[PDB]
Structures are given as C-alpha cells and as structure tokens.
Symmetry: C2
Subunit: 28 residues, 2 copies
C-alpha cells in the first residue's frame, strides 16, 4: 500500500531536475 | 485504479510552482 504511494513523491523529484537544467541556462 | 495514479502526475505540478517563484527571484 505504502509502496504504491512511494511512486507519487517519486515523480516530484522531476522538479529539481527541471530546475537543475535551468540553473545552467541562468548563467548562459 | 486510474484515479489513484492521477495523484502521481498531480504532484509533478509542484515542479512548475517551484520554478515560477524562482522566475521572480531571477530578476530580483
């Protein structure tokens, strides 16, 4: 039951990724 | 079944939010 949810908070990790690439475009 | 998953892609929306506030700090 809890294992299924672990997928929800999992995708939220995509946020930091989106920002990480952006941090590269900020200085270029 | 599909309704439960709709929660997964749901949180992913938190990404745009995080970026939105950042876009404000970029020019200030």
């Amino acid at each position: 039951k809890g294992a299924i949810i672990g997928l929800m908070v999992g995708g939220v990790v995509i946020a930091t990724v989106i920002v990480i690439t952006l941090v590269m475009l900020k200085k270029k």
